[model samples]
Target: RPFSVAEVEALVEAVEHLGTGRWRDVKMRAFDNADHRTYVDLKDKWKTLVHTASIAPQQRRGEPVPQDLLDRVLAAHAYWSQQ
Candidate 1:
């Protein structure tokens, strides 16, 4: 089953709190009840979210994510990347 809007929202929120490079912690914390979503799935979704945030808003698909959340994604990625 495709992830629901709530699931994606939870994922983004989890990433904001957990930062990058910690998919297991993210999953364990935010998605422990979502049995269908593995750590790999979490990783994939983060990649997609990063890609989605980089593209033009007009070129995006799926339920639209808030611009502020996408901005957080970039900042989190940048913040953890150099550590």
Candidate 2:
């Protein structure tokens, strides 16, 4: 199932606090109630979120993520990538 905007927001928030590479922790932290959303799903969505943030707004499609969220995604991704 496709992630909703709320799910995306939660995912981004989890990533910002927990950093990347901890999908299991992220899942528990943000999506514990969301049985359909597994850690793997979160991981994949995060990957796409990063990719989406990297490209131009016109290149993005589906459920338009807020630019603020995308900016945070990029910041968090860069912060963790360097560590």
Candidate 3:
């Protein structure tokens, strides 16, 4: 399914943020891999971090930041919940 325009924008922004690096380190090899369980064990300790950051002046320059950016961005954080 194709994402709506708003969703495409949201995805682009997420790439811009690159907030979490864990997804880059996917070590899961599934059913019969020796290292698979290690990946699962490590997954339990991952957590979300909230940090204060400043946007570079060049980045801020005339960027059309849509309100959907904020709301969708925060919604993505919901994926990190313990519950």
Candidate 4:
């Protein structure tokens, strides 16, 4: 199933608080009730999210993510990568 913006928002919010490496924790924190969303799914989506955030806005495809959310994705990615 395609990820909705609400899922992305939950993902970003979870990543902001939990960082990137802990996909299981991220899943538990934000997607516990979401049976369709596995930890691997969250991990992959985060990878795509980071890539999506780095490229030009016009280069993005599919459902458009808000710039502010992308900004947070970068911030969390950088912050977590450094740790």
List the candidate 3 regions with Cα displacement exceeding 4 Å: 1-19, 23-62, 81-83
lDDT of 4 by residue, 1-83 (tens): 87898899899999999999899999999999998999999999999999999899988887899888999999999998887
TM-score of each model, paired residue for residue = 0.81, 0.94, 0.27, 0.95
Question: How would you encode candidate 1's per-residue C-alpha lDDT over 30-81 as one tens digit per residue?
Answer: 8998889987898788788877888899888887877777787677666666
Computed on alpha carbons, the lDDT of every model, listed in order, comes to: 0.79, 0.93, 0.34, 0.92
Q: Tell me how candidate 4 scores on lDDT.
A: 0.92
State each model's C-alpha RMSD to the native. Answer: 1.7, 0.8, 11.4, 0.8
Q: For residues 1-83, what per-residue lDDT tens digits would candidate 3 score against the true structure?
A: 32334433434244234433443342222212333324333233122111101233344423334445534434444443321
Comparing candidate 1 with candidate 4, which one achieves the higher lDDT?
Answer: 4
How many pairs of residues collide in each model?
0, 0, 0, 0
Model 3 Cα RMSD, Å? 11.4
> lDDT by residue for model 2 over 1-83, one digit each (tens)?
98888899899999999988999999999999898999999999999999999999999977789888999899999998987
RMSD of candidate 2 to true structure, Å = 0.8
Candidate 1 stretches greater than 4 Å from native: none
Q: List the residue pairs that clash in candidate 2.
A: none
- The order of the candidates by lDDT, greatest first, is 2, 4, 1, 3
Best by lDDT: 2
